[PDB]
Amino acid sequence: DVMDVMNRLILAMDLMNRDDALRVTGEVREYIDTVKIGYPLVLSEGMDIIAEFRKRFGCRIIADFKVADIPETNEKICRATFKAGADAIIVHGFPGADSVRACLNVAEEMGREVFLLTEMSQPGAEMFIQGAADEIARMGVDLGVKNYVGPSTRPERLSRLREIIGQDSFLISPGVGAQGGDPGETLRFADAIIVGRSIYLADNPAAAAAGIIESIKDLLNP
Amino acid sequence: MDVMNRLILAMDLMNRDDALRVTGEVREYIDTVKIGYPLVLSEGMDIIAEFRKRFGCRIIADFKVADIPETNEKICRATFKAGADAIIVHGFPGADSVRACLNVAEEMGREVFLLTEMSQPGAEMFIQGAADEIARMGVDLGVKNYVGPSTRPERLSRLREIIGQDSFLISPGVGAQGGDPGETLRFADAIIVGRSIYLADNPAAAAAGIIESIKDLL
Ligand SMILES: O=c1cc(O)n([C@@H]2O[C@H](COP(=O)(O)O)[C@@H](O)[C@H]2O)c(=O)[nH]1
Ligand SMILES: O=c1cc(O)n([C@@H]2O[C@H](COP(=O)(O)O)[C@@H](O)[C@H]2O)c(=O)[nH]1
Ligand SMILES: [Cl-]
């Protein structure tokens, strides 16, 4: 029982104006039913952008808010985000168990889902996050987290994350394309890949998405 | 940065009418408001300009920025476009992610505050062990503004030691989370206070009371 992500491909819609974001998302609609909306778009166009995407595309919405505050503020953020119509929210694990639990409690109450971000894809992740990541992931499992985010750019780390969370957990992975991660290699471990710039900055986003999907065709579910 | 009464209001009410009313009630006591995601996600980024129009306060956007460098740049740009004077950024994601924020702040005439250790009990699990190194990274990157926890004065003092007396340090966890205003101001330039003021029966009296308790420190 996990979200059914069409073509194992999630669009990271980080364009910052409504017109372009709507155009590109519409162009790739036949390939992707799950869109990750983050703060670049939300802070530029408002939380109503979630409403507009639901109206226009009917896509599933993951709010990539990397929630990273104290328990009381995390609760408020999750409440506001689910109220606006997000299906799921992404939460940092590094602030600790209480901060994560606050998000899980709201998701449970409100009938939505939390994704736990355990390690990140940027080079700077090696400084502090990488050393804590196995324990952050183990903490997530202990807390009952079922959905996780881990980095395409570090296949050995993504593999270990998959081991810790088990085969039944749901794992999505960014860093594919622009940051250097390979779609097929990433799907060895992740249930779905997240792709932003490779698609949304392409002259033909639909062709870019179709091309990624063609490259992973033998990895799709019947 | 010159914060009136060394007191920053954490305005985490989630509706515009209450947030504006309560801020107005305490306006004589403050000139600096921290606005975070509870208010922004409920009422929109336009709330920042509205606070400036009504109160002419400085605005710190407490967005705990914690993404990759490319996304951090976008978040900072959108935030400063909305009129924030400063933004709070996590150090835990590493130097590149912090640098991305420093760059946009310089471009738009704003400040970055580096959050190095957090105030909640869970901060002990992963953040605390990294916090001194995160602070040293801030120093190496030229960060001048920092955030550290009222709930652990010995850790707040250590942060002040690392960054030096010339850096600017603000500190949440005062009141509701158990931190003491006067003790916190031994180390921090200003205290951040949310619930003790905004959930008080009488927010103005609450703010006035806090200020009375630290009057010899002003
Ligand atoms: O470790 C992580 C976690 C993320 O959410 N992301 C997010 O995934 C997306 C990556 O987009 P892109 O394909 O353009 O690199 C961005 O929205 C980014 O904020 C990431 O790149 N690395
Ligand atoms: O370590 C930290 C960092 C924060 O920004 N904060 C923020 O400071 C404020 C504290 O509010 P309060 O006084 O109601 O506890 C909240 O907005 C919270 O998100 C915190 O409590 N601890
Ligand atoms: Cl690796």
Curated annotation (Swiss-Prot), chain B:
**Which Gene3D superfamilies does the record match to this protein?**
Aldolase class I
Q: Is Lipoprotein found in the keyword set? A: no
**Pfam families linked:** OMPdecase (PF00215)
Describe the reaction catalysed, as an equation. orotidine 5'-phosphate + H(+) = UMP + CO2
Q: Name one GO molecular function term.
A: orotidine-5'-phosphate decarboxylase activity
Q: Set out the biological process GO terms recorded for this chain's protein.
A: 'de novo' pyrimidine nucleobase biosynthetic process; 'de novo' UMP biosynthetic process
- Catalytic residues, chain numbering: K64 (proton donor)
Q: Which GO terms describe its cellular component?
A: cytosol
List the InterPro entries hit by this protein, alphabetically. Aldolase_TIM, OMPdecase, OMPdecase_arc, OMPdecase_AS, OMPdeCOase_dom, RibuloseP-bd_barrel
Q: In which pathway does it act?
A: Pyrimidine metabolism; UMP biosynthesis via de novo pathway; UMP from orotate: step 2/2
Binding site residues for substrate: 12, 34, 62-71, 119, 172-182, 194-195
- Role this protein plays: Catalyzes the decarboxylation of orotidine 5'-monophosphate (OMP) to uridine 5'-monophosphate (UMP).
Subunit architecture: Homodimer.
- Fetch the PANTHER family from UniProt: OROTIDINE 5'-PHOSPHATE DECARBOXYLASE (PTHR32119:SF2)
Name the UniProt record assigns to this protein: Orotidine 5'-phosphate decarboxylase
Query: Which source organism?
Result: Methanothermobacter thermautotrophicus (strain ATCC 29096 / DSM 1053 / JCM 10044 / NBRC 100330 / Delta H) (Methanobacterium thermoautotrophicum)
Organism lineage string: Archaea, Methanobacteriati, Methanobacteriota, Methanomada group, Methanobacteria
